[PDB]
Amino acid sequence: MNYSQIERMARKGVAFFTDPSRPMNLIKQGEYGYDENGFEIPPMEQVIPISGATRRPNAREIDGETIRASDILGIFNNDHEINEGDYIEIDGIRHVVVDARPVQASLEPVAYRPVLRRVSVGG
Amino acid sequence: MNYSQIERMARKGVAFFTDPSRPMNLIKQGEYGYDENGFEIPPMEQVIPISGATRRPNAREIDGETIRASDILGIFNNDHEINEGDYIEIDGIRHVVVDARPVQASLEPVAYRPVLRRVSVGG
Amino acid sequence: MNYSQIERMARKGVAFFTDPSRPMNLIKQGEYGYDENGFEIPPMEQVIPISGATRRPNAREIDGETIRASDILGIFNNDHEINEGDYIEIDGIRHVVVDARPVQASLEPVAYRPVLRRVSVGG
Amino acid sequence: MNYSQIERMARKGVAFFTDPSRPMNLIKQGEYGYDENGFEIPPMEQVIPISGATRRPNAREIDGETIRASDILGIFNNDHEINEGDYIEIDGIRHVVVDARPVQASLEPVAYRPVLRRVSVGG
Amino acid sequence: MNYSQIERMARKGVAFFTDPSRPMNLIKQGEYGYDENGFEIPPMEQVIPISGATRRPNAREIDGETIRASDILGIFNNDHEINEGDYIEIDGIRHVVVDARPVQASLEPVAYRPVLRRVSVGG
Amino acid sequence: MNYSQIERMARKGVAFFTDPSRPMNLIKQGEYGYDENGFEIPPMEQVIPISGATRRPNAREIDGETIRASDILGIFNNDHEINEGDYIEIDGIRHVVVDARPVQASLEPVAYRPVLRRVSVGG
Amino acid sequence: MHYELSAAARAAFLSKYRDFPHYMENRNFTPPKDGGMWLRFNYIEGDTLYLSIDRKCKSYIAIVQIGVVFPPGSGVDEARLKAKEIADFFKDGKMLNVGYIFEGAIVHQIVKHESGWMIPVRFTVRVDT
Amino acid sequence: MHYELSAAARAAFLSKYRDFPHYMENRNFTPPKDGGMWLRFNYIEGDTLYLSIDRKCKSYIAIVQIGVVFPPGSGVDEARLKAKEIADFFKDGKMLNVGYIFEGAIVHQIVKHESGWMIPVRFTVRVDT
Amino acid sequence: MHYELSAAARAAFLSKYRDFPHYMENRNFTPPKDGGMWLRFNYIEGDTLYLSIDRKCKSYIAIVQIGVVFPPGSGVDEARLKAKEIADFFKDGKMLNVGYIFEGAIVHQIVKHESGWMIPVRFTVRVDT
Amino acid sequence: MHYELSAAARAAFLSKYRDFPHYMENRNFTPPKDGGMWLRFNYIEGDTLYLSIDRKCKSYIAIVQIGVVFPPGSGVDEARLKAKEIADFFKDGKMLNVGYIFEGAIVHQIVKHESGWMIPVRFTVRVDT
Amino acid sequence: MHYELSAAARAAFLSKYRDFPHYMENRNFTPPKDGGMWLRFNYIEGDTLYLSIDRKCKSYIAIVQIGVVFPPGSGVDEARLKAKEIADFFKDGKMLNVGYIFEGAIVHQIVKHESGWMIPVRFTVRVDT
Amino acid sequence: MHYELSAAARAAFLSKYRDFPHYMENRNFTPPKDGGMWLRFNYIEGDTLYLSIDRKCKSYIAIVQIGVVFPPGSGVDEARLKAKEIADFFKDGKMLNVGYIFEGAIVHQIVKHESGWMIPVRFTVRVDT
């Protein structure tokens, strides 16, 4: 298969279904370490603007507490690789990508379908 | 993706399936605070008339007690935003919107599909 | 949406699917109260003949005891309203309406799809 | 609906799918009582030959013990009524009808779809 | 219902889907008994060659132990009857037929669809 | 059933769906034993290059710990047999073949659909 | 000797309530069509004590449970009067045909459901051999 | 004699809280339409002690549970005021129509849900025969 | 020593109820075709005591369970008679081939199911070495 | 008197950490958008002891739980510093507006999840009347 | 010292049973093709006591489990005979290569399944340092 | 004090095993690509005793767990060697940077899975203020 053809088809589809006005950023963390006395050193972060489509909004319940939060899935093209553990901000609220399922038929990811979960929400 | 076209078609469909005679109101609360001694100050509420369609009536059972209540889902347009935690009265009985799933492909919600649960009903 | 058209079509279909020979009655209770010493007074009951169709017969098992009972679902028109908790007798055996799901698109119930459960049967 | 037409069509279908060679009997019990000294009196039984089709053979497992038994469903016509608790012998092995679901659209059962379970097998 | 026609077609299909090179045998045990002192007498076994088709290989996990085993289903004709509890060897590995579902529309089994489970594998 | 035809069609389809650039290797272990004092002798290992297609990427969660791992399924031809317990490296990361379901209609496996699980990940 | 003990318990209950709708063990029963108050009879076995060194002096203990069931919606007055009626026929020190009542009938806690409510009532029996 | 004890408890609760929306056992109740604070009344039975050797001296103990249910989102101060009001009407050593109070009302821990919260308040009763 | 002891128990049962249908462990069985009362034989081991300081005086205890299974719908009179018959053949202080009966047969509580009922009967065995 | 006790505990916490993002009971809260460390305030009731014969001397005990919630991935040192800060403000023998502290604050074991971690911190209170 | 103790247990087992199909930990095993009786070897660790005040005198205890697995359908006399054979080789007070046996082998209750039955046999070890 | 105690323990582990694949808490870790033995470090808190009447003499206890994870198929002897090496570095009565070891390392029972096995090793810490 001409995976390049599949890649361009997927990119055009994602561009078709996306909304340019929605601002989405990708945040990745740097190296972490510990000093000689046992304490840690905080890691640096980098912000990379991205764009894509979303799907499946889902709510969350915590033992009946009145805490409001939501979870969401997304679709992205093959421009910036999205490893698990990164942070993606949909519209200001930060989401952590628990799982980033790629289209799995080749070496390049072709496309990403990350599973985004709302961050700083208790169990 | 002329989201405006999608919005207009969704509004037309919702207006097609709704019943004008049914009176439905949307209730939102204001700010809440606490005094210098620890007691609270009640928050104000605002009533906003709304209209839409409903679907899936579903009943509730409580440990065999003879308590009668029902739950119901609804569909609404993007006129008044519906956040989770608000109160919607279908016909006088107050329902709390546990989850308000919006049609998610753009910045504007386009349409809402709230999940309404009967209020003041014990666990 | 000329709900009147939907109502008349639903009534015609239901009347098409019923059997006139089957005698069914709807029973509703009155007010209940307590005297000045704490004892109670029985409530009055009213019998209203009805007609409709049935579906989905299902049996019941109780801890292996040799007790025979069954549960049936029903379909009815919007002649007499059927609130939850009422008693409907299919052919002499009394069934309690645990849930009465109405066709939910308007003020009038249009039609009812009650869930009947055998009464006086242990858990 | 001309339930008579439905009845004759169902009878024709059951006769089509049945096997005449298979001998099946229906066993019903009589009255039971207790004497003035607490001891019980055994009830009488009556054997009524029947015929029909079968479907869905299923096996049974008991705590890993090497016990072999099977369960099976059946289809019958409205010649002899089949109440729950009766005994039906498929080919010599006696099956107890835990549930006998009838075609529910009229006063007469039209047809029966009993659920037969193997007897004398511990749970 | 010319069950003979159904039997012939089923046999033709099974012969179409089978592989002649695969050696499969059916093993049946004889009578068992005990002597006067409580000890037992081992039963005899008989080996009957068979042939058929297989489907659905499925593996087994035992509490995380590194034990490798598999389970598999089969299809056979009505040449040699296959009761529950017998042993069938697919290619040298012995499988015990926990359940042998026959085609249930007649006195003769017409066809068999046994469920084979790997033997000598701990729970 | 000219299984040779099925084999060649399956091989052609698989080779159609693979990506040649992806390096995959099959690793098999040798014999293991114990000395006269109770200690062990490590077993030898052999690497065999392979090629195939993959599908269904799935993530893993361990008690809320921040450990990232994933599991993938694969499809392979009948060139090198893949028994359960072997190790397959997709792109450097080693996966253990918990289950290797073959196309089961003949003596030769025709094709393999192994289930790969990430190794050295916690319970 | 649980056989004769259960036979004697069955002897007594029927004596007072052979007409009121009820349920005997292992026999097919159908709840009343109208929907009303029936009684469920259950016999639970217990321990057999060895009060000797000769191993030839033993006693048997069993628990008898009668439970009154009423439809949801009626209310609770008739259930409690029927429970009192049951308890006043099963006092202490009653000599049945074979055996005696070690402990009397006590009214237990209501067990509720959406298709029937029951009030368990139970007592004990004993024989010495 | 749980009949008369439950009757007395029902008498007292209704005497002071007849108007307040409430749920009584085995009667079809509908929660308030606007959504508000109703009261759930439950009567839980207990044990019957045999405090004698003649087997003719026995006492009954029962537990009464009143639960305040309030909508989610309002806040928890009014529910605590109502619980205090309930507990200050069911003090120790209060003689009802038949029987007395063995222990007072104890305000327990909130039971949460997404459609309503409840505060359990329970006390005990006793009668000697 | 569990091996020989199990054989002894197996011998006595067969010596008495060989005609009745019965299930032996690990060996495939088909319940009666008509439907009747078969017997389930189980052997449950116990602890191994060390009643010495030289660690060479040990005794074994095992629990034997024979269960009467009868169809649902018939009633419960025959099962209790068969339980009495079983219990009167396994009395206390009975010397088997290699051992004796420590504790006798106790008729336990019915285990109900919708496809058959069972009455467990248990007794203990002991061997001293 | 749980009303005033909870009022005093809420008074103290608000006094020191009013600005810090926090959750109060039965009020609709939204976790921080950027994702950060908020505080969950929970008040768990207890028992009321009857330390007298006159039945007019009773004390109330309640448990207050403050939970530090922080995003996953950052690390666990700041949460421990904040827990120490909370624990050093709720020492033993501290007189609130009404009541006192029976026991100090104990930092407990982390509760983990894939969307946030929490470190529970709890202490007790007491009022004597 | 669990290293050498497990080594000694594996040594003994292999010494007498290096032929019978057997399963060693963490190595890929394939049950017999024909279907037969293999042996599952498992080594379960325990506690290490501190039997001193100098904190320099410790004892290690481990539990060894040998489980005979046999096909369903055959019958159970061979399994019990092999269990007796195993238990008569792992007696109490036996000096292994490093350490000794603290308690002998006890035949436990059969664990049943529809694809195989297992009879567990276990014993303990101990080393002093 | 748990903050400081945790740091001390972390320092020791890092001092010796710094160059070893491991998982530090709340930081994104990726298991080795080829598949190998890494170490999981977990710090579990405990209780704080009040060993005085002045309420100004407290001690803190925490449990530190180091878990050796190794792939399935290799075998279990190297994991035991690593566990012994870890245990022989965390002996009793050891001067850490702040605090000491109340109890030494204990090698526990393996936790099995189909994608990796773990051998837990844990010890305790203590500080007095």
Numbering used by the authors:
A (entry chain D), B (entry chain C), C (entry chain B), D (entry chain A), E (entry chain G), F (entry chain E): 1 to 123
G (entry chain b), H (entry chain V), I (entry chain Q), J (entry chain Y), K (entry chain T), L (entry chain N): 1 to 129
Sentences from the study reporting this entry:
Siphophage T1 is representative of the T series of model Escherichia coli phages, which has been observed to infect not only sensitive strains of E. coli but also some strains of Shigella dysenteriae. Siphophages possess a long, flexible, and non-contractile tail that plays a crucial role in host recognition, cell envelope penetration, and DNA injection. Connected to the head through a connector complex, the tail of a siphophage consists of three main components: a tail tube, a tape measure protein (TMP), and a distal tip. Using cryo-EM, we resolved the three-dimensional (3D) structures of the icosahedral head, head–tail complex and the tail tip of a laboratory-adapted fiberless mature T1 at resolutions of 3.5 Å, 3.6 Å, and 4.3 Å, respectively.
The T1 connector complex is composed of two dodecamers (a portal and an adaptor) and two hexamers (a stopper and a tail terminator). The density maps enable us to build the atomic models for the MCP gp47 and CPs (gp48 and gp49), connector complex (portal gp52, adaptor gp45, stopper gp44, and tail terminator gp42), and TTP gp41. The comparative analysis of the structural characteristics among T1 and siphophages reveals that the majority of protein components from the head to the tail in T1 exhibit structural similarities with those of reported siphophages, which suggests that they share common evolutionary origins.
